[model samples]
Target: MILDTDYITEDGKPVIRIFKKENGEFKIEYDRTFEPYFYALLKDDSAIEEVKKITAERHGTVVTVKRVEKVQKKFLGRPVEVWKLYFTHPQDVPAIRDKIREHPAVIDIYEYDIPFAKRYLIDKGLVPMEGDEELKMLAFAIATLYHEGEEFAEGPILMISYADEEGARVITWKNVDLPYVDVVSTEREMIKRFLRVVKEKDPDVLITYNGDNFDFAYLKKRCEKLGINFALGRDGSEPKIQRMGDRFAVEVKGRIHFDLYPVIRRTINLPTYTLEAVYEAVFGQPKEKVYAEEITTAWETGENLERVARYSMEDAKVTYELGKEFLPMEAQLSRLIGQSLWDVSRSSTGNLVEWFLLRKAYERNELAPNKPDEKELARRRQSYEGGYVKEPERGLWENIVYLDFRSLYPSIIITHNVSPDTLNREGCKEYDVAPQVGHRFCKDFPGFIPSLLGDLLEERQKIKKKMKATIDPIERKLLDYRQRRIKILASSYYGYYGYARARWYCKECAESVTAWGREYITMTIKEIEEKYGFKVIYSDTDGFFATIPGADAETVKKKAMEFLKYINAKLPGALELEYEGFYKRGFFVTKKKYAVIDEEGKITTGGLEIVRRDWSEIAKETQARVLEALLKDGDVEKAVRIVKEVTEKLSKYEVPPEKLVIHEQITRDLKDYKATGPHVAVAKRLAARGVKIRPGTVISYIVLKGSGRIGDRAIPFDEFDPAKHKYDAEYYIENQVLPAVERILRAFGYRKEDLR
Candidate 1:
């Protein structure tokens, strides 16, 4: 239905014509118009005249214009109103024509066919359309785009060439060209150009590899000298840049600028993390190679400008390419973390704000405001001062299994329906989630984020289930890997949200989020402990802790299953907890040492040599046989025999020369003179007191350094003293090997009787 005509209102104000579809036919009608006095309020004389002209062109009869002040209530504090003009037009019969023209003050206008009653109420200022819903949705979407898009947008667009004594070369995928000049000189130029582009393009983000620590840091120093504000949003202003190792990203005026190198290196599974490595792994091969010498010479020869330009573009393009490949995964993870795409896209260090936001949203049902003050900061630092709580000790289970909650935090966000757009019972609230700090949960309001997350979680679960059933092994592995990656990526977000270093998130918000997480972790542990009789051995921030009991693998498996089922039932649709596979055929000697063998006979964690060297031969043999027995399905006698054989071999063993060589290599540096090792301790004492040994001479010279040979022949046992030997032996026993043995004992926690 195309209704393209205009009309006039009773107050001589130009009214636009609106068309509506009725029974598949278009119907046109005169919509309510703007008030007349509105034009008088325009400070520009030309704007006022233009409004008058627009009304006149519509052939409307000018009615008495009365100015009325209009007031709106939504602004936080100050109420705003404007004087409006009222106008009207006479009813038209046949041969009477009316037309409407656009007003100059209005740059763009749009109309919708709203209910006549509603339109009248709106026109009379009795009611106005609440654009909050629409605005909220738009903001959320824009934020998502900003966060996720930066990940995909980095790529190489230009190539750099340089020449030197080593000849000419072009920088590309084949070679990562070194800057032509010194790092400092090149950095200065890069920042200058970056500022220029930002000022010109006004892009949504400014991204660079190590921009925060390297590029932005350099630029900031220089910008201070130039007295230029590098804010890059609205009026030229400075924006904060966050440095988080190998990657630097910043947000300026709501625009996101991200660096890709750090993100790619951290997230993607690859052999190497360099730009060239990433490019080769993803795209395969290179277009050109630029040698280092060529680049150095090029700068020295005054060709730095062109070289840098080319190099920067190349880096940008590679970043863009990597971003594109990983963006979908990043987006999915971001969504799981309750972060908008905009937040994630600008997240050079992985959406720290979202972490804080999610934590807060889970607890107080609102986002936190700006950063914290000095006192609050001090308190937070003190909280983590004692280090993480240690795990409790427990007996080993026969079939000890591990159940991993996939992307637990992300799942929590999704299941809990956390989001920025949800308006609960309360009117639109800004920063809706309260952080972990002391705050009551918001009672009145629809949680926009929680609800959205809940839906996503459901969908992802369905996909996971389907993939588990029908996908090939390789495909299944890929899917599983992706699932785990998503969880990791999502979990990483919370740290950023609350981390003191997060540039995008306010400190209050970060703290609130962290507080919530602490509460949740506490609750989860309690739930598992109280419901199941199983003891938890260890737990980290997001994972569980449990120990296996008994030798019956089936019994162990059943217990694990029951625990998982109970947890799931308790949490219900809010979360998904599943058994992650167990270390049934493994053992943990202590907190840091232990090993397990999978069904495939591959060892997971722990070192065999370290264990054997520290424990008695019998203990080492028993440990190995136990693992073998598990693999062979409860053949206790056979396993015991294998241990006996291993012990026998140890009794007759001789320390090989190769072993001594390795020992020597580790302890024989020149600095070992003062250092106390088993070998060093022995060597130092023997060469002590009144020994004037020549550098090239061996032990024989040390014994006779100040005395003549006893019988005109070299002595076999030079500097040898029977009494001193006991002292040397004691020192070696106390300092050298005891520590290593203790470490092994602590790691395995086996008793002397167990070895027998």
Candidate 2:
């Protein structure tokens, strides 16, 4: 099975390299047959002759068009003729493509900027990491050189440790452990031995937390200084540092360099991306915490050198476990999209949709629309009317039943045949017209977007049925992820239509889809109130909450199911109304802000600050308890008492300092800020004290009792001292605590002074 794919230059020609793992060993297969090519729609038959003569120079090498074949393909679902231009080398395609794009004969270009490696996989029908064969996966972490002459040096590698399926090994200058440790006397020897061990293991996948920015980059630099060959690749070649959008990727040939940092950073929402936080989030267990500062000082004194080594080993173990958690889903997505796992793991939803569409376009002989230029993208950036969000009826309600539209947007697309090719300005006899936007979609034939979405939804349903029928847990897990990934891609089609950078960018199609969505939800809400005599507490986009008064929970659920059946029978096309659940009780403060206690005694909240990182834990916990008292226990007096107890505790200094810390991400550089916020103020203070403050680092601080703005009084959590400083309890009660519960309490006729 293929583990990775890349292209190498041999005899001045691009040779595609396929890295495979077979019979428990790794090897590389080279293919010199594939030529680099792209498609272009010519102005006329005569234009092809002019396009054939186009040539451009790159790196002093003149690249000319070697072949031009006229072919018939579907352009946005309609038949069209295009010229397939073949080049001598993949590197020459960009230079010559930029040159050919300006020629008067070339009307438009398609698939010109795709990376050669990706193009090869798509064309050859190869999916990376597809097989069930066991993989040699190595996860490693590095200890940097720190604290030299009262200033931090450009971190050279002081210690390195890696873990594989066999066991763990550490290479360092100090003797840290017994059996698994390779003690080297110098930094040069440490680097050399690290390389040797990595070669001996020869992992198919290289996993790291932040190797792109730190570990791999640091090791490469150390190797350069020591004149040791950083032969980390199976081809005995050095790693290449390639710029991947906003970050750099350290690529090793013949191995998939899977950096878990970017994948986790993009997929998970958290205040920090530290290994400790990520590990707890993934495995629900606290990772052993060893601060970066402690590593250096411990190594220097040799008092806790083993602790540092163990910490490094534990990091690698955590990284490997995370890889095992995320890689399966990424691999499944890779197989579905026919793209490499490395790119799929780091891709955004928009990119994933585009790549999937590209693969579909290839299979269906459809020509992909070129990515919009900056000017076109700017025009497409204009906002349109979004989904309808009905202002929720305030205060608590009983016997609440929630109704949701299943896969609403995707279903709308399939039902109305919403697509770029299906969008019509005029001359459509059969059309599905949007309500507010007045855009028309042709119902004559199935469109590309609708067809692809329908296929995915169908596949997902099939997988779900299979999952329900299967008895094995492992098979069910694989099937579940497959279905979930399908849902992600299928749901993204609506957003992809409006994305400014999308290849199939269609503002009209996106606006029309949302317009239809708003129409359906509005119609449902009206029917619920005027026809069914039910009170609508909330309705947003595709779901709504309604209450039937003077009814038991079971009766409300039965009525909801009947209403669901009636609505589904009347709904047009594939649109469906599903009875989400019946809640015993719930309260609605405003639009999208509410809490509900389900029949199972599970509490769910939306648009609440309890989950937000900026709120202190004490404030969030207090608000949660207050909500529970009111909604679950049905006692306003108990809710008020809970708040009073929390405020009293705050005044008595009973809350821990850690619980008082509010975390906020530093969104930009301190100098770039026009107004200083609390987090920004903390960052400025830390930077002024010679601490490296980078963007995206979360600043945790507590407001102190001082006569200044809150930003001025904010002290970083790490520097807080109970003997020297006290938390501003008055501010917590006034700002954090009160504001969190104010809306819900106000609905019950409680004023701010009443809480005091």
Candidate 3:
């Protein structure tokens, strides 16, 4: 099993490096035979000769074209002849491509933008951390310098903690937890000891929290300043951080470095992505709150340093637990796409779909089309018709049944043969025509994307079968993860076709797919209302909410099952309409906003304050309680009382500031905002206070009294002082509390003045 893959230049020649687990020991293997190349279609022989004349220079060394091999391949499923343009170095490929494309003879280029390491993985069919190979994982954390208005880089490493399968360990100048050195007295020695421990352990995976921006970046700078080698890599090389636009990704030479912060941010939808917040969300318990200021205060006199050490160790352990939960799913995706785990874990859904399709293209000898250039992308950005969302009959309804389509987009593509290769603008004798767009797909043959998605769905059914037959819990879980990842990848094919950066960019196919989606959902609603005598409450994209007038729970279930069978028989191809679930009672305030109580007493709320991030905990909680009263008991009086009690609590300022803290993530730079939002305002203040602010960083703040606007008085949660500063009770009452419950209360005929 290969843990990681990278390339390094040796004597000005590129060599592929692979870190593998052989006989339960880690080893490094190098291959220098593979050469870098990309495909090109030429207009004529003279064009090929002209392309062969391209040359460039890098680092004072003249770079030349190695060779051009003519080969027969399929471009967009059409047979064509192309030249494989080989180069001495991967860096020179892109450099020479710019010069080569200028000639009128060169028709088009393909696969020129892929990175060398990724191209190597795709060509060699390598999957990182493949199969059941046990991974030795190590997690670490650093307590850096902290103080008001202090620069982050100026802060010395107060302590370092390590957590692994064996146990937790700490390294510091203070006497604590079996120091490797007899007396570790300086920051320099502390870092050296930490590196020594990592080298000795040689774990396959290293886990950290925000290591890209904070942990690893800080350590690299400190090591350079202190004249110490930051040797955290298994190949005796130092780690490096590469900037991707605004964010950074830290890479270790021979180890797969897992940053839980970004992984959790991508995987979970949480208001605040702080380590402690994510841990509480995952484990349903709060971690002991220890701020950076506390760590600084503890390190001053060396008193309670042990407590700080324990906190650091807990941070590492929590990161390790999160890695354990997410890494396997990533591995499954990596194996499916034949890409490295690092790339798979960090890639977007569209990118994943592209990679999978590219691999499938390679297998079928199809030449991948080049990504859209700037002008083409601009043209592709034009808006199209999206999913249909019906307005809701805003009121409480009983005996509700929710129906959903299984893999809606994927099924539409498969059934209609919607693909770039199959789409036709001209009239066809036999075709599956889109509802409103009038686009046609030929029924003569299966399309490239439809066939691929169909095969993927078939593969998932096999894995699901294995999952059902397996009795071992772990095996079942692994099989289920594989199928889930496949489903996600398979379902994203429609979006991939529509992506501006996609190699298979086809706007017509995307528009037609959605047209079919709207048509199907609208037809399904008609069937339920007219054929089955059910009242349709609402419908969105691929699902709908409906109920029988006088049906009981058992009667509704029976009718729903009968309707499912009838619809399944009428549907096309593999498309299915399944009985998603039943709701005891559901309330709809508007389109996309509703709450429902299941038979198991579980309340599912959507598009409400309880599920959104802009609302504070108090506001969300108050809305939850009000929703509970109305959905569970239908008690209007109880709901009104709950609102009145919360309003009174806010009036007296009895609610803790912690509960009133509202967290919002900054989606761009502080200066990029055209309008000053609350989070942006708080971020600017923090930046002035010497705190580093960047995109994707969450800001927790409170609305203070005497605000010009909400942004004017929005203060960071830490800077809010109870003795000097006061929260705006009026804001919470009018903007937070009353607004949250007004919609629900309106369904019961209670207005804002009545609530007041």
Candidate 4:
């Protein structure tokens, strides 16, 4: 509902209408009116000269030009040779655009008001502020074109349905496998029908797998030839092929084309990004193996076309499932950051961080600092000593308590006000201190970044609370969804400070935050060991596993709570520690690696690479078995027995080659390898046969028996024959099996002969 309308501004700008964004029961954000604009970089004198020439040619007066630096930004960051153009008047940009672009000095010409990153608006204060409420409301009202007529909405999702013989149709809705279609003898009818369905549905989101690279591009090509207009957008506008830095995208007016595969690529850090691979990994099932390179042959041979149909249906279903999971994140992110969902869905973390700060900047009536340039990055040496890793005791403890600071970096951020705006100021302040790297923050005012992060932290806390208290499953799920997103956002606050591309990136700010983090960990250890008379069994970053003085279960629990309370009051900003867990027994192998078995026999591990692709599956299985045997039965002899069983299988060549295959990514070119190893040798084999092996290609190779070095024996998995390929039994038993068993054995006092 509209709360306020037709209001004037203190800054003498257009008014905006304010209304509730009322949909989700979790949050009801107020939507206000605002207009967006663009930015361009051009040569200063060149642009001026070109403008003057255009004026002279048109006005019939030879006007001599001096480049007038107009608006808020003319020359930002770059040495005065380049001029930054701020086009606030959107419609006016085109009138001067042709004249502006004709010059050789036009380094870049782009729209800011629409396609550019959303942060530019907030960073430049083009949006409304708290003090300018009337202006803010009026701008919203006017920007809305009076909130009177049919407003634009991203609605009913559309899916594409393809065919083998015929280049097919577009689908609507998700619940059904293959939605909306029309059988056609020619390409023109199919294309027209697809557009007809799209026009009727007016889809807000269009889902496809690698549609940017394949499906949409193919559809547009067919439409262009057949005289079918590629009018797919909600408002009957055409979809445009837009360039986003390195990649090309199919952007629609008033809607988003969520090419699901690219979203996965942007988010996931997997080696292979084939839709099949991602589906297998994320959804635990493969894309229907029905259609392949043989699909065309099958169609030509007049074989069953059902497989082709099923393939199309299956792809759409998977695409819909992915959209279901990913779109919610984009929607929530855009709402929080003040960017459109279409833009935010595909944005990187740096831009996401930038936009959030920009959104707050508009509201706070603050300015966003310029991004760190290459020269600035070069000047700032990478020397920040990050989170302190506390040395652990490396033994078993009967009664241990886990105490960890809740949101350590964010707490430090709020307490110390570690941000660009808050740095380089002198004051009498308790919150002004930093360790190792002697940096101080402003005591006078709260920093923009800290304030933004604090908001995230506060919201997360509320969500977590609601999540715990709520009984309705739907509400609980929504709370969790919001909680997970904000927690992820909150955790990244420290990294964003360190990011070189960050608009607010400050070495001092990032360095100071790390300094405080390190100090807190050190302070935590001191408090437990010196004052409380307790032994800290393990310490790492923000958490510690400490044994009580009395060391009884009840007493240890009591002591942990007591210390947490005392420490909570001691720290600034009500910064506190949560007793994450109290273990009946715990084991610390090293500073970062540990194992804990709770009272309920719940086994937990840290810093173990058991599931890593680089490690052999057998090795991971053995490692897990060793840990389980030790924890479950507390038996060294049995652990030794389990290790011998796997090794004995290896010695006898009874272990399957599949379990022994190790997949490692070829991180560089084959010749770029300074050191030759298993994956490198395998990669060279691939290159020798004229097989395509890119840098990012994951090489799966098995170590076989050979004379001298390990690399000499490496065989690619496909070429590997169990019968012909000699098994490296001795190597597997010694190198692969023992090291994992050794970790468990050391704690149990086992000797080398136990392996036999």
TM-score of 1: 0.40
lDDT of 2 at 671: 78
Q: Give per-candidate clash totals.
A: 81, 0, 0, 16
* Candidate models: Cα lDDT each: 0.40, 0.84, 0.84, 0.62
lDDT of 4 by residue, 561-664 (tens): 88887877778773677899978777778777888888787778887646467767788889888777777667767888988888889878899987887788
Q: Identify the runs in model 4 with alpha carbons over 4 angstroms from their true place.
A: 1-202, 213-231, 235-248, 265-312, 426-431, 464-476, 548-550, 656-658, 665-735, 749-756
Q: Is candidate 2 or candidate 4 better by TM-score?
A: 2
Q: Which candidate achieves the best TM-score against the true structure?
A: 3
Clash count, predicted structure 2: 0
Off-target runs (Cα >4 Å) in candidate 3 are 150-152, 176-183, 425-430, 471-473
For candidate 2, give the lDDT. Answer: 0.84
lDDT of 3 at 162: 78
Stretch of 10 with least lDDT, candidate 2: 147-156
Q: Kindly list the per-residue Cα lDDT of model 1 for residues 435-503, writing each as its tens digit.
A: 334433232443443443444445556669967696477456445544654445445544553455432
Candidate 2 lDDT score at position 706: 71
Question: What is the Å distance of residue 279 in model 2 from its true position?
Answer: 1.1
Q: After superposition, how far is residue 505 of candidate 4 from its true place, in Å?
A: 0.9
Lowest-sum lDDT 10-residue window in model 1 = 136-145
Over 182-224, each residue of candidate 3 has an lDDT whose tens digit, in order, gives 2389889989988998999988888888887888988988998
Q: 236, model 2: CA deviation in Å? A: 1.4
